[PDB]
Amino acid sequence: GEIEFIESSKDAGFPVINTPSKTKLEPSVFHQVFEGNKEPAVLRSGDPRLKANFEEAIFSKYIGNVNTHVDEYMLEAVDHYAGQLATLDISTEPMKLEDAVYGTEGLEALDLTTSAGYPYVALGIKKRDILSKKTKDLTKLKECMDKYGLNLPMVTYVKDELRSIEKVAKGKSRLIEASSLNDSVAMRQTFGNLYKTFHLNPGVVTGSAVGCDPDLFWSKIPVMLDGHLIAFDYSGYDASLSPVWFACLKMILEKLGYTHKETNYIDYLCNSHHLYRDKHYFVRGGMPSGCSGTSIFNSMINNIIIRTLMLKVYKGIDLDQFRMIAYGDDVIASYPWPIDASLLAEAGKGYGLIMTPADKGECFNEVTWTNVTFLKRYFRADEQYPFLVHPVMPMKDIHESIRWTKDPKNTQDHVRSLCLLAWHNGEHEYEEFIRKIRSVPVGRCLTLPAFSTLRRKWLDSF
Ligand code: NA
Ligand code: NA
Ligand code: NA
Ligand code: NA
Ligand code: NA
Ligand code: NA
Ligand code: NA
Ligand code: NA
Ligand code: NA
């Protein structure tokens, strides 16, 4: 990804986008009870905690583009991957508006809580001012779409989330893009069926985990990932994607049945126009996280990338025995024979990608079912039912999360959510977590599930 042009918004007639100022994250009643090091990400230039230039830090993910054409390795990779997807019989037919906007199996209704993007954000118009869940009205929507059309600027916001001491100090806050309501809907119509199929088929055929439920999916992963595990990370995956990978995505989407016209939206994602506070800029390359389907498209592209690197380094590799599952930039895969991830990583650097050892490790050490993680969770087979696998979210992360809140009125829901993640760490660990929660008055006012109940429902869910 590369920023090709940036100027002050007023010069082009765009009003300043009034993003927040203060973080919505505040210390929760459990802040003192549990230990933690993370803090809200920097949101403004003057943050006292900064030890670097903020503006410069947040745009540093756009490391540039390796300009190249789709080589022979990418072609074979697309072919093989496309071969897998064909098996799913993905409908390239547009999804009817009501399904694409208000919900259907495989595709949750459009979030009425998030930004409507441009120009609505400048006209004080919210999603709820156009859509209504109980009415499923589409008259105003059709009104707005016809009026403003498609291909509108994206609104760039700084993600208000917890970050490590280092990320805060370096001001490395994440940037998310809010696509215009018009574009979100148009895309959901265009790729709605693809989204649905992916959501209903997490695994090694889609090569995607987007929309999976760790409680159930974890026990299927080891069955799917047969051989020697392969796992590594990316640094700034999204912003590092070069136009070439989008070209690959378009080829694969076309092998699926989509027409050149329908894949034009991929161009919308690749060559974007952004509005960030008082600035407005153009970007070439990079996946604009936040727009419709970016998680699924990041996953699809990752399936092409890894296959591409494997073919380039290991000429003579048999992809038919290769297995992988991606959730955006997070990857976990297997091959019957050992593979040197460091070699793949260097080959990636040649394609403008920054790959590193799984979980910030020293080296591309042996990945095992004991140390491997996916979606930040570890894998631990149940002691009594070996075929059932526990998705283990580190208690450390649970502790970090419970110490803050964006809205105290959601404590009951927040804490219960954490409980659903914590018990997988074992009964002793669970009991301590519960004891400390109850060491605060609010804690004794919450309806917290008992371990034995969590275990029983989990076992019964299969
Ligand atoms: Na603690
Ligand atoms: Na360029
Ligand atoms: Na070539
Ligand atoms: Na391994
Ligand atoms: Na979407
Ligand atoms: Na999704
Ligand atoms: Na080889
Ligand atoms: Na039992
Ligand atoms: Na966390």
Say what the resolution is, in angstroms. Answer: 2.2
Terminal Cα distance for the chain, rounded:
43
Give the count of beta carbons closer than 10 Å to the beta carbon of residue 51: 11
**Fold that domain 213-242+293-368 belongs to in CATH:** Alpha-Beta Plaits (3.30.70)
Residues whose Cβ atom is located within 5 A of ion ligand 3: 71-72
**What's the 107 CA to ligand 9 centre distance in angstroms?**
27
Q: How was this structure determined?
A: X-ray
**What's the 342 CA to ligand 4 centre distance in angstroms?**
12
Which two tokens mark 71? Answer: 């080589």
Residue 215 host element (H or E):
helix 214-217
Domain with CATH 1.20.960.20 in the chain: 376-462
CATH of domain 376-462: 1.20.960.20
Measured CA to CA, the distance from residue 310 to residue 347 in angstroms comes to: 9
Q: Angle formed by the axes of helices 294-313 and 72-86, to 10°? A: 130
Measured CA to CA, the distance from residue 366 to residue 149 in angstroms comes to: 51
Ligand nearest to the CA of 385: 8
In DSSP notation, 419-448 reads: HHHHGGG-HHHHHHHHHHHTTSGGGGGS-P
Which two tokens mark 116? Answer: 């409507």
Half-sphere exposure of 407 (CA within 13 A, CB side): 3
Ligand nearest to the CA of 286: 2
Which two tokens mark 424? Answer: 């997988």
Residue 91 host element (H or E):
none
CB 202 within 8 A of CB 210: yes
* Cis peptide leading into residue 119 (ω within 30°): yes
From residue 100, give the alpha-carbon distance in Å to each of 96, 107, 111, 209.
6, 7, 11, 21
**What's the 344 CA to ligand 4 centre distance in angstroms?**
14
Measured CA to CA, the distance from residue 376 to residue 413 in angstroms comes to: 21
Measured CA to CA, the distance from residue 99 to residue 142 in angstroms comes to: 14
Q: Which residues pair with 203 in a beta bridge?
A: 208
CB 333 within 8 A of CB 229: yes
Which two tokens mark 42? Answer: 């920097």
Nearest to 355 by CA among 336, 379, 333, 337: 333
**What's the 135 CA to ligand 8 centre distance in angstroms?**
46
Q: Which residue has the tokens 């952004």?
A: 274
Measured CA to CA, the distance from residue 39 to residue 134 in angstroms comes to: 38
**What's the 205 CA to ligand 4 centre distance in angstroms?**
21
Q: Which residue has the tokens 């992360």?
A: 397
**What's the 72 CA to ligand 3 centre distance in angstroms?**
4
Domain with CATH 3.30.70.270 in the chain: 213-242+293-368
Q: Dihedral of CA 294/299/302/304: which sign? A: negative
Residue 56 host element (H or E):
helix 54-58
Nearest to 269 by CA among 250, 287, 244, 245: 287
**What's the 188 CA to ligand 5 centre distance in angstroms?**
6
CB 355 within 8 A of CB 233: yes
**What's the 74 CA to ligand 5 centre distance in angstroms?**
26
For 97, the 3-state DSSP assignment is helix
Which two tokens mark 361? Answer: 């490790």
Measured CA to CA, the distance from residue 181 to residue 114 in angstroms comes to: 10
CA gyration radius for the chain? 23
